[model samples]
Target: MQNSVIIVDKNGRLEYLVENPGGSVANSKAATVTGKLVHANFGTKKDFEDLYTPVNGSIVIVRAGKITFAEKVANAESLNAIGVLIYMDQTKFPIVNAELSFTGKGKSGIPVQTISREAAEKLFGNMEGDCPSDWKTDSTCRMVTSESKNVKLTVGG
Candidate 1:
């Protein structure tokens, strides 16, 4: 197993760069965050009902400070969710200080944690890019697939 990191500026351009861990030189691509969720076979009403009924307070953590995961939590909470489950979109990368905590206004009172994208995808399949646009969701854009294999690391023992 290996570790990596990347830095990007506000304009969505590469800024500073760091890669690998433990002072190793390797070729590894940038980290990717992918979102997934479980779907019910029943109708929309039934699915929504099922999701909101138990109210399991499971919190989900995302890689970036974006609203995609937060919005999903809010929607579930609105429907009477008690627990929330969150994870990274792609792999099981640890996201420190990335937990979503709703202190005020319709909080679900659930626990949130960051998980790897590999785990998330297991629970919920990949979301189609068109789904967002078709649903008239805000800031709908094509999901990115970045490929870069350059790694550098520094470590001390």
Candidate 2:
């Protein structure tokens, strides 16, 4: 199956569609997850903790940087998040595969995918402000569907 992430409104209207070349999942075996969308900046533990809203079982979206990919997923996993989607904040050409290397497992148990800056902004509402340390979660609530493929990553997301 193609690696992708999709966001839709309450009525399931397509808001954004990022498939294949635009993005990739951590690994092909990554579980498929669906849940409410929530943005949590850098995917740091504090970032997840300071989330203005709850993310018990939501698909948390964070920018790619400031922290390791595995660290981000671990933080989100600890927060009871079902999945994570990281978007390239810089000018990266293609959204390459993300690595979730950590400890012994060396992979994330929770599904993790990467999206483009365009898709991130769509969900984040193109807001700009101090992030990670001080940021406000987007009030809009959308639904996300994501899954992955079998590819190893060298650079961490």
Candidate 3:
């Protein structure tokens, strides 16, 4: 038996199709890393919603290895992000069934998912022009997915 899944990287680039290795339940945690910039410059939740008009009541995925990316997605939902997908770094791979967290609030924010180091490395390698000299520095990849209906509500309503 085989299962198909979507893969994403920290830079928000969607990558190849993945085949699940049959009835295997892999459980692991992905170390979260935040982004470089602060919340203000990155924009508020409402700001992000305005910038990225995610389909209302639709499942959206946001990938990122850094916490900053997750925060950005959450902020974007403030405007109207229904679902988010986050992907962590390769170093933090093999994080199957890992309990991932994001810095945001939504009615149906859905769940955060993790991938393998091999998968993350492949995606990151393909997306980024070249690996940074400090690529090994505590960077993690993560996947965030949820239904758009979760974020279509008015802010603080």
Candidate 4:
């Protein structure tokens, strides 16, 4: 079956992004998860810590840089986030299969999907920076989950 990440806005508008689970972190077998989607600011330790609101039960989206994909998922997991979506912005390769482990920090059982920048634009519009100034208020444009088959989780560079 094809993998997909779905976003449902405040108006109940639905946007679908193609996704893949090929990474060091294992994809969860859980049914599709739905929770507030927040911009996690590159999934850094400080980024997760600096959030003004609690992220419990939320699904976060982070840029795919400045850290390994493994750390991104791990940081979100630290906050009890249920799932994560990652994307590359302002780059030629906006979407591609991610390698969650460079230092073997890959985590499992929490769905993490990667999407293209064009598709992610539906959620955040064209991005030129880490996040928008109104990112907190934009939290209303939330919730996401993945529909994908399970794959083995490995750790490597």
The most accurate candidate by TM-score is 2
| Two-way lDDT contest, 1 vs 4, winner | 4
Model 2 per-residue lDDT tens digits across residues 8-60: 43444444454343345554235666666666778788766666767787777
Candidates' lDDT values, in order?
0.32, 0.59, 0.32, 0.56
lDDT of 3 by residue, 22-87 (tens): 222112121221121111212334433433333344333333433454454455445443333333
In terms of lDDT, the poorest run of 10 residues in model 1 is 148-157
Residue ranges of candidate 2 with Cα displaced over 4 Å = 12-16, 21-23, 27-29, 125-157
List candidate 4 segments past 4 Å from native: 9-31, 102-107, 125-157
Q: TM-score of predicted model 1?
A: 0.32
How many clashes show up per model? 23, 3, 36, 1
Residue 97's C-alpha lDDT in candidate 2? Answer: 60
Q: Where's the lowest-lDDT run of ten residues in candidate 4?
A: 148-157
C-alpha lDDT of candidate 2 relative to the true structure: 0.59
lDDT of 1 by residue, 1-157 (tens): 3433222333444433433322221111123322222221111333345432232322221233335445545555564433233443333464444333444533333322333444334222222222223323223222221222111111111
Using lDDT as the measure, name the better of candidate 1 and candidate 2.
2
| Consecutive 10-residue window with the lowest summed lDDT within model 2 | 146-155
Give me the displacement of residue 53 in model 2, in angstroms: 0.9
